[PDB]
RNA sequence: GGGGGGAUGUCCGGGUCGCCCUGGGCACCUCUCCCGGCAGCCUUCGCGGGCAGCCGUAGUCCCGGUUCAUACGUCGCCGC
């Protein structure tokens, strides 16, 4: 009879909130969400949710694909790596396991 | 003084004084321990002063009077604080016979 | 958002149950007093001004 | 000073009240006082109570004997309870420090008395 | 659980109409968890359901419908009743829940129950051990409390149970607040019984000894206050009050110079204790500034041991270095000092012998 | 000890690198030419330049573009800029909270701060105003990365901990807004040992953006965040905050006590430092007007609400859902009803300079409570949904008792007892029943005077015991409580139980991956919102 | 004059550009003078302040070896004693001060010293 | 009475202590007293303190001047802290009623003073 | 702080009278584990667990007996 909505909001994680090319969007990585804001008006233009599920797993790091923009490498505590693209949501449902005891950092 | 008690530094404000300065702070505490609007802050600085400058009360005598004259008002503050609650029950009496 | 520097706000202490009200400070703010004696100490009968 | 107090109370004087009250005769005054004047009297003493808290030794005695003599006047004059309770919390502000000031008197009195001991040794030294 | 308990209650009504109080007592025994053997701890009573409690209360007590009912003992001799008193379920809220039906139009229900219940218990037992059990177990109102004090005073004014219950009632009524206590005390008492009660409390005071010379409290002050201004002027309107206030003034003088020397002896004790630590350390040879003479040092101060931990910037803690400890010790040392070294020191075993100029 | 570090390339070939390691002692070391010092058995001596300004651990250090400026930010809430060509510093001193993370745009113009109080700002350089601002929910968070300054054994080691439930109300007449208590930062809040939350922020529920922020207690963002000793200063915490019925009035309470390591000098006999603190407790009760710009304005501040020989704590307050009147119950034993009136001393009303009359809240009624002490009490209150009757649970250990008092007149209409196994935690009132929770939970009707629902909860730790709480909907007759599944640490699981009023079957049971901190009920419609410590918010609803 | 000594090194890259490596309070009063030396395998700089105590610092290994505060008291003991008369004696600018001790210490093995 | 007090203290007398203490000379005694005798003295006064709490007016003065003169004797005589703290809670039992007895004095004093008012009216009536 | 011991100095009945001891009073050094804190190394995502542990007191080759504090934007005069 009752129903529970999806998690919204969240804590802004300690990974550096990254800029886009041409300085117009700021991509901020929360825990269980990564969302991109338009800077001139301070408004989220996208919110790409990220499912987390194993009790304490967190988004370890994140960055732009330095080969091609509009791609994010995101890496969680257990070894799952996402290759998503902001301005859309292509890649949330398809992570990739790295087969690790525990991931501590990453850098592209 | 209230801000300097809210920040944990009243000891820091008092601990480096000189003789004439500490006579001055005793004098202010003695003058304004009477008012019940700031008796709390006044007795706090009084506690810290007795703790921090009780060793040279024999080395100097002019400070020794001001500690004693702090008593004289404290000995007279308790009496007015005693009588005030005597009337404090005396006014409680009529407020119960009115019903 | 550099929050601006603020001086220490003074304490709004509690007042007793007889505050010097606005009208009291008004009628005590009728401040400068001049005492002009009359001639031969006659009792002043009346004072007036037009409208 | 009965008519004196009576005038100052019903005329809302200040200096005449000072002249008659700032000094037996206290009991005689409160015996010869009248009723709603005693109510306004307690009101004015509450004002003095909060305004300058230096010498209680006269005014608490005045309030005491007033509550004695014309206390039951205020009972059948009962719409003016606010004049009593405006003082009654004023005196509960007056009790605050007795929770801890007594402990300051003890810790401080020995510093007095140790001087007193070295001063009672001093004539013989 | 509702239907099962309703059938159990219907079984109890069947047994009530069949009038077999023995088997009814045994079913209530298996409920409460005849012989009816007791545990010897008032706290150590098993949990029981409120519906069974209120049904038992409805079974034992009664009501009179005339715009003002009256509880009566349909079962004045019952281990069920003494269990109820011992487990403390005989509250006004409980009896209201038991008598929800007959009462809803009656006014002043709390006053009526708090004035009627102890009279009922007092006629049940003349020995009033059941009453002291009531005062020791049940949550009581101020009405019930002043009523039980009334019953004890009529009983007295084999000889310690009543005084035990009377002191328990005194502490309970001191805990009870001012307004309801004054109202019910003025309601249920008469000024002469109040004067007798004040004589009882004067006996408590003078037997505790607050006037009878040395070399040759809360509850009593509170109770005397509530009784005195529950009667008020309309009761008294002498030398009785003159001698009474004389003894009260003697007591207050005692307690005021008492708080004086309480502060004094507390500060001297704490200084002597720090002195115990400091004398042990100066005997060991840690070389601090110790007093020696028979008079007090002015500032009641000692030099504690220098801590093994320091404070760095901004807030971290590190272990002290022996170098800095020696620096502070050379600081703490005074102007002139005799520091004798021994052959055991030159061997490396014992310590030195130090006497410094008393600064 | 390495807190953070930023490297910069001396250049499409890579000639050298220059690294800045911000070390948790509060230092910022600059290693100049690492590759040219390590290309060449033997190496020449290297010597890092030391820049020391912060006191605690620096949280972020970054070189700015062309490499003239070494910008940095720590816990002292100040973005410092090391000039690095001269020897000077220049800095933006007064942010909201600790500087948690920084970055520089590809162009050198924009800085971007991630602030510890759930925020981010894009600044334009030498404008130094936030060109872009984003703020979140700012609750208490159990951070996975624990702390950058918990590494070096400070005086008070900051712990990932939750102490108390979040003080949060959903405001009527704008249900999409939510008022809730936040300190300056998360780290600065939980630091020092005690929760220190003297700020209220308003948060939008439809679109989860933090609207605005305001101060309740005294708060100095212009002063030093640490004392001289090294202890983070603790501010007065807003313990209880409940909302009016009109949507326009607000009542708050702040409590504050000095530190036990601070007192040290008031102890005379058998008095401990905890005793000295509990004696020098300061508590204010403040009445605020709420303006439609979500603006809080003071009208009244009482210094001694429940007063006896010393100050006594205040246990709870609640608004009458029909009239503007706040009841408060406290450690004294009496229950006080406050109401608003107009300032009128002698027929001379005092008005705002715009002309509107000043109102002021004062004590309307005083109700002493009955006490039944068999041989450290608490309190709770709740009005009815129809007014005129107030339920007041007084809370000594196991013996604790409820009193239902008329509000038109100070007479007691009812008193029930025997309804608590331990110390009371809280109490609400549905359409006819009282839902109270202590160590056990009891739904109890008062129109039939009977315990409908009883529940024994599983024995758990004291932190979880303080952490359970409930909330009722009042529109669809349904309550819901919140409990963590069994000292508190990071990875815990919690479950909430939405019950209906009538039955014993919980209509919804859901375990949560993180422990929930706040439960509130939107007043305009049915359902609830819930705030979780990994600070995420979501709504539960029927249909 | 902030009793403060700072050490400056060239920045890598551009020429002739200097920057402050590190600073520290070595003395206790204001640092009034200093002179360096580099020879026979010893690279030192000695700084005299107003606390009468010259501090030496290693130069080429600065930050790699501790400094050293030389004694401000003179190298000659400047205290002498006639043990028969129990007289101790010292001297400075134009005065010679003589103390008598009047007793042993076996007697004292508080208020008499 | 120095040797008198000194004898009674070191011999654990009772009646000689009564003879010298049950009555200036008090200060002279405590000046001429000796040290561990003062410790036992405070112990004996603590006994009298709890046993019969009637007249404090002499013994609190005795304890006062003892803590003045030979207080610092107990400091270097510091294994006997229990003699101080066995009194120090005894006096915190002695403060109990000052939390509420003062309020009884006020409510009761008017009943005295109202009699006093009808008694000051009585000679003139 | 406790429990216990091994050994240091002491008087009161003392003992053939000596090594000391029992009964009372005791202050110190040494060992022993439990108390409060810190650290390291493995297992777990964490919660926790395991391992050999140090500190709870004193004076150094020199010496951390250090390092550390919160900006601009505009000043002045008078009134309510």
DSSP, residue by residue, H26-53 = HHHHHHH--HHHHHHHHHHHHHHHHH--
Which chain F residues touch H92 with a CB distance below 8 Å?
A: 269-270
Buried b (16+ CB within 10 A) or exposed e, F316-335: bbbbbbeebbbbbbbbbbbb
Burial environment of residue H31 by CB neighbours within 10 A (0 to 12, 13 to 18, 19 or more): middle
Report CB contact under 8 Å: H96, E217: yes
Start-to-end CA distance of chain B, whole Å, equals: 45
Q: Which two tokens stand for residue E228?
A: 């005195």
Closest CA to F509 of F521, F523, F499: F499
Closest CA to E140 of E113, E104, E103, E108: E113
Closest CA to H28 of H6, H55, H57, H56: H6
Give φ, ψ of E239 to 5 degrees. -60, -25
Answer whether F334's CB lies under 8 Å from F369's CB: yes
Residue with tokens 């969680």: A76
Half-sphere CA count of F299, side-chain side, radius 13 A: 23
Answer whether E143's CB lies under 8 Å from E114's CB: yes
Q: Does F54 touch chain E (CB under 8 A)?
A: yes
Which of the other chains make 3 or more beta carbon contacts under 8 angstroms with chain A?
Answer: F
Closest CA to F535 of A83, A97, A9: A9
CA angle E226, B99, B95 (to 5 degrees): 65
The helix/strand/coil state of E6 is: helix
Would you say how long chain E is, in residues?
359
CA angle D87, D91, D93 (to 5 degrees): 115
Phi/psi class of residue F171: alpha, beta or left (left: φ > 0; alpha: ψ in -120 to 50)? beta
Half-sphere CA count of E214, side-chain side, radius 13 A: 24
Distance CA E74, CA D25 (A): 69
Distance CA F266, CA E270 (A): 13
Which chain C residues touch F220 with a CB distance below 8 Å?
A: 6
Q: How far is CA F5 from the centre of its chain?
A: 32
Q: Does E275 touch chain H (CB under 8 A)?
A: yes
H helices of F132-185, where?
A: none
Q: In the PDB record, what is the listed experimental method?
A: cryo-EM
Burial environment of residue F253 by CB neighbours within 10 A (0 to 12, 13 to 18, 19 or more): buried
Q: How far is CA G30 from the centre of its chain?
A: 13
Report CB contact under 8 Å: F540, A4: yes
Report CB contact under 8 Å: F270, H99: no
Number of CB atoms found within 10 A of residue E358's CB: 15
Closest CA to F426 of F390, F387, F448, F395: F395
The helix/strand/coil state of E260 is: helix
Distance CA G112, CA E162 (A): 69
Q: Which two tokens stand for residue F327?
A: 């009841």
CA separation, residue F540 to residues F491, F516, G7 (Å): 23, 13, 64
Q: Which two tokens stand for residue D97?
A: 């420090």
Distance CA D125, CA D120 (A): 9
Phi/psi class of residue E19: alpha, beta or left (left: φ > 0; alpha: ψ in -120 to 50)? left
In SS3 terms, F465-520 reads as: HHHCEEEECCCCCCEEEEEEECCCCCCCEEEEEECCCCCCCCCEEEEECCCEEEEE
Residue with tokens 């010679």: G96
Q: Which two tokens stand for residue E357?
A: 């100029």
Answer whether E187's CB lies under 8 Å from E147's CB: no
Closest CA to D64 of D35, D86, D41, D85: D41
Number of CB atoms found within 10 A of residue E151's CB: 18
Mutate to test the interface with F, among E6, E315, E318, E319 (most CBs of F within 10 A): E315
Answer whether D8's CB lies under 8 Å from D17's CB: yes
Distance CA E340, CA E351 (A): 9
Distance CA F288, CA F216 (A): 9
Q: Which nucleotides of I are covered by protein (CB under 7 A)?
A: 27-29, 38-39, 44-48, 55-60, 62-73
Beta bridge partners of G98: G89
Phi/psi class of residue F80: alpha, beta or left (left: φ > 0; alpha: ψ in -120 to 50)? beta
Distance CA E102, CA F331 (A): 37
Q: How far is CA C14 from the centre of its chain?
A: 22
Burial environment of residue G112 by CB neighbours within 10 A (0 to 12, 13 to 18, 19 or more): exposed
- CA–C1' F256–I24 (A): 56
- CA–C1' F185–I76 (A): 40
CA angle F268, F269, F275 (to 5 degrees): 80
Query: Could you tell me the strand order of the sheet in which A33-38 lies?
Result: A18-19, A25-29, A33-38, A43-49
Report CB contact under 8 Å: F87, G20: yes
Closest CA to H48 of H87, H9, H11, H1: H87
CB-based contacts of C40, cutoff 8 Å, min separation 6: none
CB-based contacts of F332, cutoff 8 Å, min separation 6: F306, F307, F308, F312
Half-sphere CA count of E20, side-chain side, radius 13 A: 9
Secondary structure letter of residue E310 according to DSSP:
E
Residue with tokens 């000046």: H31
Phi/psi class of residue E36: alpha, beta or left (left: φ > 0; alpha: ψ in -120 to 50)? left
Query: Could you tell me the strand order of the sheet in which A80-84 lies?
Result: A59-64, A72-76, A80-84, A96-97
Q: Which two tokens stand for residue A27?
A: 């991509």
Distance CA D96, CA F307 (A): 10
Would you say how long chain D is, in residues?
125
Distance CA E150, CA E57 (A): 25
> What is F262-291 written as a DSSP string?
HH-SS--SS--HHHHHHHS-EEEEEEEEEE
Q: What's the Rg (C-alpha) of chain G?
A: 23
Q: Does H94 touch chain E (CB under 8 A)?
A: yes
Residue with tokens 């009334």: E150
Nucleotide nearest to F25 (CA to C1'): I67
Report CB contact under 8 Å: H109, B88: no
Q: How much of chain C is in helix, strand and coil states, percent to nearest 5?
A: 20, 0, 80
Closest CA to F405 of E65, E273, E140, E180: E180
Return the biggest CA–CA distance within chain H. 69
Q: After which residues is chain E broken (C to N over 2.5 A)?
A: 33, 157, 216, 237
Half-sphere CA count of C24, side-chain side, radius 13 A: 6
Q: Which two tokens stand for residue F331?
A: 């450690």
Q: Which two tokens stand for residue G58?
A: 């290693």
CB-based contacts of G35, cutoff 8 Å, min separation 6: G45, G46
Which of the other chains make 3 or more beta carbon contacts under 8 angstroms with chain G?
Answer: E, F
Secondary structure letter of residue C7 according to DSSP:
P
Distance CA F3, CA F73 (A): 12
CA separation, residue F52 to residues F63, F222, F223, G21, G67 (Å): 16, 21, 20, 11, 21
Distance CA E94, CA E91 (A): 5
Answer whether H66's CB lies under 8 Å from H40's CB: no
Q: How far is CA H74 from the centre of its chain?
A: 19
CB-based contacts of E92, cutoff 8 Å, min separation 6: E109, E110, E113, E114, E141, E144, F415
Report CB contact under 8 Å: E267, D110: yes
Q: Does H64 touch chain D (CB under 8 A)?
A: yes
CA separation, residue D95 to residues D65, D101, G43 (Å): 21, 10, 73
Q: Which two tokens stand for residue D52?
A: 């300058």
Which chain B residues touch F262 with a CB distance below 8 Å?
A: 8, 11
The helix/strand/coil state of B38 is: coil
Distance CA H87, CA F521 (A): 58
> What is chain G written as a DSSP string?
--S-EEEEEEPSSSSS-EEEEEEE--SSS-EEEEEEEEETTEEEEEEEESSS-PEEEESTTBTTB--EE--SS-SS--EEEETTTTEEEEEETTEEEEEE--S-STTT-----
Distance CA F420, CA E139 (A): 13
> What is E68-134 written as a DSSP string?
S-----SSSS-HHHHHHHHHT---HHHHHHHTHHHHTT-S-HHHHHHHHHHHHHHHH-SS-HHHHHH
CB-based contacts of B14, cutoff 8 Å, min separation 6: B25, B45, B48, B49, B52
Distance CA D111, CA E171 (A): 40
D44, closest residue in chain C (CA to CA) = C18
Nucleotide nearest to F26 (CA to C1'): I68
> What is E12-59 written as a DSSP string?
HHHHHHHT-HHHHHHHHHHHH----PPPS-SS------HHHHHHHHHH
Closest CA to E182 of B94, F395, F392, D76: B94
Answer whether A12's CB lies under 8 Å from F119's CB: yes
Preceding omega of F37 cis (within 30 degrees of 0): no
Q: How far is CA F272 from the centre of its chain?
A: 28
The helix-helix angle for D25-32 and D56-69 (nearest 10°) equals 40
Burial environment of residue F263 by CB neighbours within 10 A (0 to 12, 13 to 18, 19 or more): buried
Give resolution in angstroms.
4.0
CB-based contacts of F112, cutoff 8 Å, min separation 6: A17, A19, A26, F102, F103, F104, F105, F120, F121, F122, F123
Q: Which of E92, E168, E270 sits opposite F375 (nearest CB)?
A: E168
DSSP run (H or E) holding F45? none
CA angle G14, G18, G23 (to 5 degrees): 145
Distance CA B31, CA B73 (A): 9
Give φ, ψ of E136 to 5 degrees. -85, -20
Distance CA E88, CA E140 (A): 9
CB-based contacts of E338, cutoff 8 Å, min separation 6: E354, E355, E356, G105, G108, G109, G113
Q: Does H89 touch chain E (CB under 8 A)?
A: no
Which chain H residues touch D71 with a CB distance below 8 Å?
A: 110, 114
Report CB contact under 8 Å: D115, B75: no
Dihedral sign for Cα atoms in the order F42, F45, F51, F57: positive
């Amino acid at each position: 009879s009752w129903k529970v909505s999806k998690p919204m909001g969240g804590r802004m994680s300690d990974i550096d909130p990254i800029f886009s090319q041409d300085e117009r969007h700021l991509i901020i990585t929360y825990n269980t969400s990564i969302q991109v804001y338009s800077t001139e008006d301070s408004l989220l233009v996208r919110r790409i949710a990220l499912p987390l599920t194993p009790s304490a797993t967190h988004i370890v790091s994140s960055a732009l694909s330095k080969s091609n923009p509009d791609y994010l490498w995101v890496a969680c505590s257990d070894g799952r790596i996402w290759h998503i693209n902001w301005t859309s949501g292509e890649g949330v449902d398809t992570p990739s396991t790295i087969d690790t005891k525990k991931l501590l950092d990453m850098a592209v | 003084l209230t801000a300097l008690r809210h920040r944990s530094a009243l000891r820091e404000a008092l601990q480096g004084r000189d003789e004439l300065s500490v006579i001055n702070i005793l004098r202010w505490a003695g003058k304004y321990v009477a008012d019940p609007r700031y008796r709390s802050i006044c007795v706090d600085v009084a506690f810290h002063l007795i703790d921090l400058y009780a060793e040279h009360v024999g080395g100097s005598a002019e400070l020794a009077t001001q500690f004693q004259q702090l008593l004289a008002k404290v000995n007279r503050e308790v009496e007015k604080a005693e009588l005030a609650i005597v009337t404090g029950g005396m006014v409680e009496s009529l407020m119960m016979s009115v019903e | 958002m550099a929050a601006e520097v603020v001086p220490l706000p003074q304490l709004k202490l509690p007042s007793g149950p007889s505050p010097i009200t606005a009208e009291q400070r008004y009628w005590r703010s009728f401040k400068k007093q001049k005492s002009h004696t009359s001639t031969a100490n006659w009792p002043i009968s009346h004072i007036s001004f037009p409208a | 000073l009965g008519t004196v107090l009576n005038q100052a109370l019903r005329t809302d004087d200040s200096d005449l009240l000072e002249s008659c009250l700032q000094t037996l005769i206290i009991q005689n005054t409160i015996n010869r006082m009248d009723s709603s004047l005693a109510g306004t009297l307690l009101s004015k003493l509450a004002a003095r109570m909060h305004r300058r808290p230096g010498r209680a030794f006269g005014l608490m005695r005045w309030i005491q004997w007033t509550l004695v003599a014309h206390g039951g006047a205020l009972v059948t004059q009962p719409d003016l309870i606010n004049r009593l309770t405006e003082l009654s919390r004023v005196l509960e502000e007056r009790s605050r420090g007795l929770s801890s000031l007594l402990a300051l008197k003890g810790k401080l009195d020995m510093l007095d008395a140790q001087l007193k001991y070295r001063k009672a040794l001093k004539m013989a030294g | 659980s509702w239907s099962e308990w309703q059938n159990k209650a219907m079984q109890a009504d069947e047994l009530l109409q069949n009038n077999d109080i023995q088997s009814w007592e045994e079913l209530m025994a298996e409920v409460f968890k005849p012989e009816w053997e007791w545990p010897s701890s008032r706290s150590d009573y098993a949990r029981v359901d409120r519906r069974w409690v209120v049904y038992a209360i409805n079974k034992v007590f009664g009501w009179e419908g005339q715009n003002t009912g009256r509880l009566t003992c349909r079962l004045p001799e019952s281990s069920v009743l003494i269990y109820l008193v011992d487990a403390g379920h005989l509250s006004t809220s409980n009896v209201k829940s038991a008598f929800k039906d007959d009462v809803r139009e009656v006014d002043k229900v709390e006053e009526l129950i708090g004035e009627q219940l102890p009279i009922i218990l007092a006629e049940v037992d003349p020995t009033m051990e059941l009453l002291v059990g009531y005062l020791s177990g049940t949550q009581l109102g101020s009405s019930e409390l002043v009523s039980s004090i009334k019953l004890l005073l009529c009983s007295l004014g084999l000889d310690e149970h009543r005084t035990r219950g009377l002191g328990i009632a005194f502490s309970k009524l001191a805990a009870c607040p001012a307004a309801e206590t004054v109202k019910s005390l003025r309601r249920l008492f008469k000024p002469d019984e109040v004067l007798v009660l004040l004589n009882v409390l004067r006996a408590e005071l003078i037997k505790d000894g607050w006037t009878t010379r040395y070399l040759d409290i809360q509850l009593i002050a509170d109770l005397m206050s509530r009784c005195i201004d529950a009667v008020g002027l309309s009761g008294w309107m002498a030398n009785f009050f003159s001698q009474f206030q004389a003894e009260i003034s003697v007591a207050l003088e005692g307690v005021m110079e008492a708080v004086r020397l309480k502060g004094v002896i507390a500060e001297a004790a704490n200084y002597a204790k720090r002195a115990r630590r400091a004398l042990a350390d100066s005997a060991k040879g840690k070389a601090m500034t110790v007093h020696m003479s028979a008079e007090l040092p002015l500032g009641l101060k000692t030099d504690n041991k220098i801590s093994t931990e320091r404070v760095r910037s901004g807030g971290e803690i590190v272990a002290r270095s022996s170098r800095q400890i020696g620096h502070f010790i050379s600081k703490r040392r005074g102007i002139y000092s005799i520091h004798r070294i021994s052959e055991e020191m030159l061997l490396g075993a014992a310590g030195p012998t130090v006497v410094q100029e008393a600064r | 000890i390495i807190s953070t570090f930023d490297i910069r390339p001396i250049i499409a070939e890579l000639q050298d690198i220059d690294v800045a390691v911000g070390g948790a002692r509060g230092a910022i070391y600059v290693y100049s030419n690492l590759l040219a010092h390590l290309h060449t058995l033997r190496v020449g001596t290297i010597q890092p330049r030391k820049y020391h300004w912060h006191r605690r651990a620096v949280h972020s250090v970054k070189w700015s573009g062309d490499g003239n400026y070494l910008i940095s930010g720590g816990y002292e809430t100040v973005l410092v800029l090391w000039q690095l060509d001269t020897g000077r510093v220049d800095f933006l001193p007064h942010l909201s909270a600790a500087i948690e993370n920084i970055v520089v745009s590809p162009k050198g113009s924009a800085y971007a701060l991630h602030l510890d109080d759930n925020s981010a700002m894009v600044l334009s350089t030498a404008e130094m105003k936030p060109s872009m601002y984003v703020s979140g929910i700012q609750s208490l968070v159990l951070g996975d990365r624990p702390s950058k300054d918990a590494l070096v054994r400070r005086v008070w080691r900051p712990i990932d901990e939750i102490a108390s439930p979040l003080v949060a109300t959903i405001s009527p007449q704008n249900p999409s807004h939510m008022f809730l208590c936040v300190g300056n930062g998360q780290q600065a809040t939980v630091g020092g040992g005690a929760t220190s939350t003297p700020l209220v922020q308003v948060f939008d529920i439809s679109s989860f953006q933090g609207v605005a922020k305001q101060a309740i207690a005294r708060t100095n963002p212009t002063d030093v965040n640490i004392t001289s000793e090294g202890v983070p200063i603790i501010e007065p915490t807003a313990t209880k905050l409940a909302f009016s019925h009109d949507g326009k009035w607000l009542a708050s309470i702040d409590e504050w006590q000095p530190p036990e390591r601070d007192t040290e000098a008031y102890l005379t006999g058998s008095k401990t430092q905890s005793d000295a603190c509990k004696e020098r407790r300061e508590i204010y009760l403040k009445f605020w007007e709420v303006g439609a710009d979500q603006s809080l304005e003071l009208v009244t501040r009482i210094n001694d609400a429940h007063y006896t020989k010393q100050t006594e704590s205040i246990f709870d307050l609640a608004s009458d859902p029909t009239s503007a009147r706040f009841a408060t119950i406290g450690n004294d034993g009496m229950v006080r009803f406050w109401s608003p009136k107009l300032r009128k001393r002698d027929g001379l009303m005092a008005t705002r300079p715009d002309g509107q009359p000043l109102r002021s809240w004062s004590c309307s009624r005083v109700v002493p409570l009955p006490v039944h002490e068999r041989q450290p009490y608490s309190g709770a209150i709740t009005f009815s949904e129809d007014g005129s009757i107030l339920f007041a649970a007084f809370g000594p250990p196991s013996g604790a008792l409820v009193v239902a008092i008329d509000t038109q007149t100070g007479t007691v209409r009812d008193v029930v007892s025997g309804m608590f196994k331990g110390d009371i935690r809280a109490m609400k009132s549905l359409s006819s029943c009282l839902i109270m929770l202590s160590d056990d939970l009891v739904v109890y009707d008062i129109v039939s005077d009977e315990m409908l629902a009883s529940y024994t909860l599983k024995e758990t730790s004291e932190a979880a015991k303080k952490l359970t709480q409930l909330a009722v909907n009042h529109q669809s007759r349904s309550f819901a409580l919140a409990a963590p599944i069994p000292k508190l640490k990071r990875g815990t699981k919690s479950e909430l139980l939405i019950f209906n009023i009538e039955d014993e079957e919980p209509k919804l049971v859901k375990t949560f991956s993180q422990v929930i901190i706040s439960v509130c009920a939107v007043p305009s419609s049915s359902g609830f919102v819930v705030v979780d410590s990994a600070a995420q918010v979501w709504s539960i609803t029927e249909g | 004059m902030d009793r403060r000594t700072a050490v400056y090194e060239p920045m890598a890259g551009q020429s002739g550009r200097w920057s402050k490596v590190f600073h520290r309070r070595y003395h206790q009063h204001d640092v009034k003078a200093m002179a360096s030396f580099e020879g026979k395998g010893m690279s030192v700089v000695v700084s005299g302040g107003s606390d009468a105590s010259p501090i030496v610092l290693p130069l080429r290994a600065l930050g790699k070896e501790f400094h050293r505060t030389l004694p401000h008291l003179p190298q000659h003991p400047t205290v002498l004693s006639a043990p028969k008369a129990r007289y101790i004696l010292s001297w400075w600018e134009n005065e010679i001060r003589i103390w008598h001790l009047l007793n042993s210490a076996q007697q004292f093995l508080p208020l008499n010293l």
